[PDB]
Amino acid sequence: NSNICEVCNKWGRLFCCDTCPRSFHEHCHIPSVEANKNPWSCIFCRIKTIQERCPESQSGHQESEVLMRQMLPEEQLKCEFLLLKVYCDSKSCFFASEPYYNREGSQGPQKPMWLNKVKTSLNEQMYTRVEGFVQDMRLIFHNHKEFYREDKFTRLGIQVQDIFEKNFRNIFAIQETS
């Protein structure tokens, strides 16, 4: 097993996957690492199994169809994984916790959003469709773009949104386009 957390790349109190060499801090894994269960399989392994059980799940999909899916167990898992993929980028630190807004010449967003709030929402099963989760994710970056205007700090929102969107297309097998 790896000697660092797959998500935050630090050592500490780690839980090891039994089916692959990844390791996790308790609350870096999503969902939080389960109390018992021997053997234990991580989210990367659980996502791989879905694909292996239904190879055709990797054929291309339209985003509009994906968004309307109900949050059944397999779509819940895919959203948890997509969330985890964003936390895997160190630039996710800027979007993790509750923001505040007091900048000359800007007003804060009408509906603030941050990664830990989406994490809790997923944990508490507050999304009924994929669209709910993806809307809150995109809102994080859109709020940041609007607030920071022409400050070059806006680019952090662009950068982390690109990680989100690449992973969204991969995890949900969105049809490749030009």
Is residue 50 close enough to count as binding Zn ion by CB under 5 A?
no
Q: With CB under 5 A as the contact rule, which of the stretches 34-42, 59-67, 71-79, 116-124 interacts with Zn ion?
A: 34-42
Q: How far apart are CB 109 and Zn ion at their closest, in Å?
A: 29
138 burial via Cβ count (<10 Å: 0-12, 13-18, 19+): middle
Is residue 54 close enough to count as binding Zn ion by CB under 5 A?
yes
- Cβ closest to Zn ion, residue 21 vs residue 151: 21
Q: Which helix (H) or strand (E) holds 157?
A: helix 154-171
- Cβ closest to Zn ion, residue 48 vs residue 169: 48
**Alpha-carbon distances, residue 176 vs 86, 162, 168 (angstroms):** 21, 16, 12
Three-state secondary-structure class, residue 54: coil
Identify the residue among 15, 23, 29, 42 touching Zn ion (CB under 5 A).
42
Identify the residue among 2, 31, 40, 45 touching Zn ion (CB under 5 A).
45
| Planar angle of CA 34, 130, 77, nearest 5 degrees | 20
Residues that bind Zn ion (CB under 5 A): 5, 7-8, 17, 19-20, 25, 28, 42, 44-45, 54
